[PDB]
Structures are given as C-alpha cells and as structure tokens.
Amino acid sequence: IQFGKYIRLSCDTDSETLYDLMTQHWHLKTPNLVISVTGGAKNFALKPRMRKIFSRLIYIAQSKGAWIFTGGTHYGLMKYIGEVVRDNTISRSNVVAIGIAAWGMISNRETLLARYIMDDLKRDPLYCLDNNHTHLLLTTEAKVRTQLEKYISERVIPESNYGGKIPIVCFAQGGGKETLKSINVAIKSKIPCVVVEGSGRIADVIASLVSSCVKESLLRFLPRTISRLSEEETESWIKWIKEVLESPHLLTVIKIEEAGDEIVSNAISFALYKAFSTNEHDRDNWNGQLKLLLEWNQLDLASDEIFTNDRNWESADLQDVMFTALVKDRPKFVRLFLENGLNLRKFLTTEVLRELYTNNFSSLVFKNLQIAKNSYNDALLTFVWKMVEDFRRGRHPLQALFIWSVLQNKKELSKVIWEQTRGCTLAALGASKLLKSMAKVKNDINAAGESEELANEYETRAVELFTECYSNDEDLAEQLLTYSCEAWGGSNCLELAVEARDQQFIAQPGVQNFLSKQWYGEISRDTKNWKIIMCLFFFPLIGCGFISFRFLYYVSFFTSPFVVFSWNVIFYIAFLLLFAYVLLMDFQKEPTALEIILYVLVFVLLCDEVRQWYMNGSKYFSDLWNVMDTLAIFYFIAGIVFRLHSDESSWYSGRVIFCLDYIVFTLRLIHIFTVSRNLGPKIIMLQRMMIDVFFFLFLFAVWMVAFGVARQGILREWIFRSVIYEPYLAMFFPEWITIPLVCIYMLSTNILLVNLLVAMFGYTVGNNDQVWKFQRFFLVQEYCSRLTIPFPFVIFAYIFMVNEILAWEAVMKENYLVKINTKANDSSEEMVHRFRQLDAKLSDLKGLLKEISSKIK
C-alpha cells in the first residue's frame, strides 16, 4: 500500500500460517508483543501524560523488538501510535506496528503499490485507514485479532527467555464496549496479562476495583454511556468486569501518582512477571524469573523476590546471568550479583574478556581509539591499544573489565567495577587519563563531551579517595602515590595525574605536601629557611643540633633538593663572579689557569644539560628559555675556538663572544630569580606573559625590518647588513609624504602598542588555585628529578653511572564508599519514602477499621 503492506481477510482465515506469513516471507520474530485497545474513538484526549506513556511504549517496543497490534485506523490513539512509530523510525533508536482492521468499515478500496486516499474525516461513519502502520490486516475485527494473540501466546520459541511463550501484554486505556470486551478475551481465552491506566472510562472502572458497586463506579467514569445501551446489556457489562477480577494477577495499573519515567517499563515487566510467577510451573524456577527481571530493569523485584534466603541459589551458577548483566548495560544488576556473592576475579577468565572486546566492544569506540592512538598518543594509550588488540586477536583481570567499561563511556557500570579493583585511586586516575585522551578525538562531540565529564568524575573519585587515604595515614598514602602498579600502564598515581593534567588531584593538600616533603628531602620542614642557608656556608652547623633531619646527616643534608638548588644558585653566582674576574683582569693572551677552571665549569654545565637531553622526547626544546642555555654554552664553546687562533682580529673577537655570553649567563640567573620568587600564584601570570612578550618582540622585530626597507629604500649582501642592524642602531624630501607618514606612526603605534597591552593583560582571560598548584607541582618535580647532587660533584655521579598498601587502600575505599551513601541522606531528606510511610500507618487504621463494620451490620 502507498499513502506498508496489506492482506485482505475474512474472519475465518487459516491455521496459524498467518504468523508464518509474517516471519518467512516477511520480518523477524518477537521477544515481546504489545497489543493496544481503544476502539474507533475519533476523540482522544491526547494529554502530555498520555503522550509520554505511548511514546515510552513504542520506545520499549524497539528496545525489545516487539510487534504492536492496534486497530489500523486514523483516529486518535491509533493515529498517534502510528505517528510515534514513524517518529521512532526517523529518530532511529525496527518497530512493527501491525494494524487490524475490519475490511468492511474502511472508506475506499483498491485491489491488486496500491494508492490510498486520505481525503477528509467527515460525518460519514465509515473509517479511514491509518497511514503510518507498517503492516495492515483487513466490530468485525475482534476475532482474527484475538485468535492471533491466542496463537502467538502459545507459540513456543526455541530461544525461550520467558518460558518460551512469546510475551504478550494487553495495553488498555479509555472506554467503550469494544475495549471492555477485548480485555475479557485477553484474560479468559488463554491467559496473557493486561495493563490498564489511570485515565479513561473503562480504564478507570477497572482501576477503581483494585455487586452493583461495580455499576456505582461505572457511572462515575462513564455516565453518558449507560443512557444508551440496554439493561440487558448493562447486566453484561457488570458481568464482563466480573471475569477480569477473577484473575487479579493479570492486571497492572499505571496510577496517576507515578509522575515520572520508568512507569511503562515498570508496568509491562510487572505484568509479565506475575504471568510468569502465578503460572506456578515456574515458582520453583528462580533462574527464569531472574533473566526475565534482568532483561527488564526491575532491580527491586529481583532483590525482594529472588534473593530472599528462602530460595537457595549458591552464587556459582550466576556466571551467565552476570555476563548478560554486563553486555546489556545493567549496572544495578552487576552490583546486585556481587552483593549476593560473586567472585568477580573468578568469573573474569581471559576468554570472557576476549568475548567482551570482540563481540561486545562497539565499533564506533574502537574507531575512536585509532583516532586517539595515532593522533594524540601517550604511554598509556600505547598500552591500552595493545591490550585491546591482544583480546581481539584471540594479568589484572579486574582492570581489563574496568578499561572496557570506561572506553565505552558506560558511566554507572564502570563505577560498579571500580569498587572491585585493587589499586583504585590509580584506576580512577588511569581512567581519567584514558578518557581525556578519548575526549581529544573530535570525530564526535557528543562522545568526546561525555568522556570529558566521565574523566572529571574519575578525577574527583581519585581526589576524594586519596583525601580519605591521606587523612588516615600520611606515610601509607605517600607509598600509595608512588606505587609502580605492576603495569597498570606502568605508572604511579603521581605520574598518571600529571600526564592527564589532572589539576584537582595535584592541587589537593596531600599531594602538595608530598612534594614539599620531596623538595625538602630528608631535611624536615618547620626548621626555617635561613636555618638551612646558614648550614650551607657553615659545615659543622649540620652536625650541631640545628636542623631536624627526622656521616649520614651530612649526606641527607647535601642531597635534599632545597640544598642542591641553593648550592647551584650560590655556585652559579660564584661562577659569574669568576667569569667577570677572568674577563676583565685576566684574559691576557693564553688560557690562564683561572680560565681553564671556567672551561670545565661550563663543561659540567654542558654535561648536566645533555643529561637533560635524556628524559628528553624533545620536550626540552619547547621550553623557550632552556634552549637559551645550550645556545649560551654553544656560544661559549664557539668563543673558545676563537681564542685559540693567535690572530688579534680573532682573539679580540673571541673576547667579544665571551662578553656577549656573560649576559645570557646572567639572563639565566635573572630567569632563575624571577621564577623562584614568583613560585606561587604568579607563576600563571608569569610564563604566559613571558610568551606574550615574545610575540610582541617578534612583531616589533617584523616592523623594525620593514622600517629598514623604508629607510634604506629612501636613501642610496650589503643589504642584510644594513636593513637589519641600522634600524636598531638608529633607535640606539617632504613632497607631501607626511600626510601619510605620521599615519604610518599612528598605525605603527596602535598595532605594537596594542600587542604590548595584550601582553600585559592576556594572562587574565582564559579554579586558579588548582591551575597554579598543578604548575607549582610541575616545575618543582623536574628539579627533584634533576639529579639532586651538588653541581661541581655532578660529574662524579655522571661518569659513575657509565602489596599491603593495596590491602590498606581497599579498606580506605570501603570507608569512602560509606561516606558517599551516608551523605546521600539529603537526597533521602525528601518525601519519597516519607510520604506513604504514614499512609501505611493509616492503612493500619484502615486495617483495624476492617474489624469494626465486620459485626455492626
């Protein structure tokens, strides 16, 4: 059909190959089958509540793969049911909406792509077919429908998730004789369950009953119906409601009090559970009721009615029930199976994990791994992309599952498996490092936008766990920082927080105190600053009772990074005073013995820095001031070979290279003074302003070159020696050209002035205690890594080179996990549980008012 399939049928059709028509020449079979009953009511109060209930129903029908049996006409609900079906195929979350019509009640007919005319819906009582139903089969209709549902309820499937039985549910709302008749043929012919609602005429007369008091409530909800149909038909209606309350287990109500989601999936699953439970051929079966309550998300029904200690499972049979709890993303059920006993390390064999990374790893996330591994590479990503490829080509098993959940952005499933890991403040940072690598991938903003926040949730979990760890024992938490992880990724929690730029983990007072312990070395804090400095100039004051080291005292003093840095600054000044004494009073013609001292004092400055050409990765060359140090030392060695040339034009030029080298050796000392003073909140203002003036001095040099072309082009390989140098030395005819020449200077200034003022203020635009404390931790960490031994005795170390904490961290996790849930009492402060806790207390008053009218009548 074209406004879709069509089949003409009379009522006495065939023997069940109508279903085999639907599955052999046609679409797939069913794990679920909802039917809808509203009749040909042209009026339908389409409330936004009714819009949610019948949009969740189509969403559930594609979440399970169901058919929907409706009258296939273009009126009200069954028109709206079709529109949510085409809304679902457009949104692409398929769903099959099979329409059941009379063939005698339709408007037009075309017999053979057939064309149908949706002309207009006037006063003619014939019905208009609906345009959005995927299949159409054509109160004539209410036997071929009811025999089909009485077939497929008995159709035994070999898959058999719901005792075989192809789960049927009858979704009912609204009034009319036809919807009250169809609930009867639902319950009484065979027994599929029925779901009713809290709005409608016939829907509320059965919702009120969960006698002639039937008819009392019946004229409450539909009084203008009784005035037309007969009293020999009013007697049948009270009779009809009597055969639906004979089976009160096959009825679930959607009460108006449920003002939220879950409510359509709660009602269908509860109705499917009773029709599984009250069958009683299944009450001994705890396992079929588990997979039924796990395919749906009924956590509370599984906790109350399957794990009771009246049923006796023994938790070793719970293996395949756990695997489907993982791959369907049921985070409440993987938590329920561990709470009721499951050794998750025993369950996670290596072929289960390769069953998880092959079949259950999504190809979109695996596509974003290649855009992460090849474009934004790290030491962790090369480990994890290797670890994914080992499983896909077919030992810490709890972290292979944890990486699997974190990669797929499974937000609540990964937090269940994180509480089972052993190194769990390290798995939280290892997830935060991994997710921040996936958040760099700009192939999808929605995937990267949720891996970015899942990284911030796991950074906050590592903060709150380590704050719990540091508050209990400092010396144990600092062993937990530097734990070498047995190849988690081959990193500490401290390394893995600084690659990820995890500023909240690094700015916390436990980590910042660990670095101050590292920088002071074996010298304690609280001594004083000047108390350590005066022990530098005075050796026997160390052995005196003067510092607090918490001989072996002298080696602990002179290997602390505070002392080594203070020595390397004091020796650098004494190097500069010797470099100034040689350059002025000495330096006659030959390399004097005091200058030979300077030749080895820069060689130990050179070997210290090609040592920093290890731990290198060409990170060192993007530091913008550390490249000055090589080019100060390379300019020194170039000034040595000009000294050993015996020409007075070259010897003097060898001195000039040394005198210009004295400034960059002092500019390094000025740079050391300006960073060590502004270590503190100004280190963000510094080094961002410092790259901002390098851009302004670059643009000033570009303008100074262009000023040279305008200078030399106005006047008369010589050009490079005159277009570059003389504009700086000049800062050391009028045709009418001053009409633009001051407008040159009014445009030269206001592009160099603005670039200067951007440099002063550009640090402000674009948390600033955490932004600082990461960088203060960053800079101090490299010097504590920079060979904490005195500088002239660095060569004597350079050429001489040529799990009970995890048990302790596990008990700190349990104290941390309690402190989350006991703080979620302001969430339980609300009237959620508090509302009908006392309506239970007046139902007890109702339960004792049962006793009163029992004997007064």
Ligand X SMILES: CC(C)CCC[C@@H](C)[C@H]1CC[C@H]2[C@@H]3CC=C4C[C@@H](OC(=O)CCC(=O)O)CC[C@]4(C)[C@H]3CC[C@]12C
Ligand Y SMILES: CCCCCCCCCCCCCCCCCC(=O)O[C@H](COC(=O)CCCCCC)COP(=O)(O)OCCN
Taking the complex as a whole, the smallest distance from the CB of residue 675 to ligand X amounts, in Å, to: 9
745 contributes a contact to ligand CCCCCCCCCCC by CB under 6 A:
yes
What CA–CA distance (Å, rounded) separates 121 from 126? 9
Q: Which residue in the set 2, 309, 359, 529 belongs to the binding site for ligand CCCCCCCCCCC (CB under 6 A)?
A: 529
Total Cβ atoms within 10 A of residue 844: 11
What CA–CA distance (Å, rounded) separates 243 from 182? 12
Q: Which does 201 bind (CB under 5 to 8 A by kind): its own copies, ligand Y, ligand T14, none?
A: its own copies
Taking the complex as a whole, the smallest distance from the CB of residue 783 to ligand T14 amounts, in Å, to: 4
Strands of the sheet with 5-7, listed across from one edge: 5-7, 135-137, 96-100, 67-70, 33-37, 168-172, 193-197, 251-254
Taking the complex as a whole, the smallest distance from the CB of residue 673 to ligand Y amounts, in Å, to: 4
> What is the DSSP secondary-structure string of 479-494?
HHHT--TTSSSS--HH
What CA–CA distance (Å, rounded) separates 687 from 759? 11
Q: Which does 176 bind (CB under 5 to 8 A by kind): its own copies, ligand CCCCCCCCCCC, ligand T14, none?
A: its own copies
Q: At residue 53, what are phi and psi to the nearest 5 degrees?
A: -70, -35
607 contributes a contact to ligand T14 by CB under 6 A:
no
What residues contact residue 19 under an 8 Å CB cut-off, 6+ apart? 148, 151, 152, 155
Instruction: State which of positions 655-674 bind ligand Y (CB under 6 A).
Output: 666, 673
CB 55, CB 21: distance < 8 Å: no
In the DSSP assignment, the letter for residue 137 is: E
| 747 vs 849, beta carbon nearer Na ion | 747
Q: Which residue in the set 554, 609, 703, 762 belongs to the binding site for ligand T14 (CB under 6 A)?
A: 609
Q: Which does 133 bind (CB under 5 to 8 A by kind): Na ion, its own copies, ligand X, none?
A: none
Binding residues (CB under 5 A) for Na ion: these are: 748-749, 752-753
CB 769, CB 507: distance < 8 Å: yes
Q: Which does 783 bind (CB under 5 to 8 A by kind): ligand T14, ligand CCCCCCCCCCC, its own copies, none?
A: ligand T14
Total Cβ atoms within 10 A of residue 152: 23
Q: Which residues pair with 253 in a beta bridge?
A: 196
680 contributes a contact to ligand Y by CB under 6 A:
yes
Q: Which residue in the set 191, 679, 685, 784 belongs to the binding site for ligand Y (CB under 6 A)?
A: 679
What CA–CA distance (Å, rounded) separates 327 from 68? 26
- b vs e for 16-50, b when ≥16 Cβ sit within 10 Å of the residue's Cβ? eebbeebeeeeeeebbbbbbbbbbbbeebeeeebb
Total Cβ atoms within 10 A of residue 51: 12
| 4 vs 727, beta carbon nearer ligand CCCCCCCCCCC | 727
Q: Which residue in the set 5, 29, 42, 671 belongs to the binding site for its own copies (CB under 8 A)?
A: 42
779 contributes a contact to ligand T14 by CB under 6 A:
yes
Interface with ligand CCCCCCCCCCC by CB under 6 A: which range of 357-365, 525-533, 694-702, 720-728? 525-533
Q: At residue 252, what are phi and psi to the nearest 5 degrees?
A: -125, 135
Site string for ligand CCCCCCCCCCC, 692-731 (x = CB under 6 A): ----------------------------------------
What CA–CA distance (Å, rounded) separates 654 from 639? 5
Site string for ligand T14, 146-175 (x = CB under 6 A): ------------------------------
606 contributes a contact to ligand CCCCCCCCCCC by CB under 6 A:
no
Q: Which does 533 bind (CB under 5 to 8 A by kind): ligand X, Na ion, ligand T14, none?
A: ligand X
Length of the chain: 857
CB 347, CB 322: distance < 8 Å: yes
What CA–CA distance (Å, rounded) separates 261 from 258? 8
Rounded (10°) CA dihedral 302, 303, 306, 307:
150
∠ at Cα 208 (204, 214), nearest 5°? 95
| 505 vs 565, beta carbon nearer ligand X | 565
Identify the three-state secondary structure at position 829.
coil
Taking the complex as a whole, the smallest distance from the CB of residue 577 to ligand Y amounts, in Å, to: 7
Identify the three-state secondary structure at position 34.
strand
783 contributes a contact to ligand T14 by CB under 6 A:
yes
Site string for ligand T14, 708-747 (x = CB under 6 A): ----------------------------------------
Which pair of structure tokens corresponds to residue 469? 């760890």
Taking the complex as a whole, the smallest distance from the CB of residue 241 to its own copies amounts, in Å, to: 15
CB 61, CB 34: distance < 8 Å: yes
Taking the complex as a whole, the smallest distance from the CB of residue 592 to ligand CCCCCCCCCCC amounts, in Å, to: 29
83 contributes a contact to ligand T14 by CB under 6 A:
no
Q: Which residue in the set 114, 210, 245, 573 belongs to the binding site for ligand Y (CB under 6 A)?
A: 573
Interacting residues with ligand T14 (CB under 6 A): 565, 568, 605, 609, 625-626, 629, 632, 668, 672, 675-676, 679, 779-780, 783
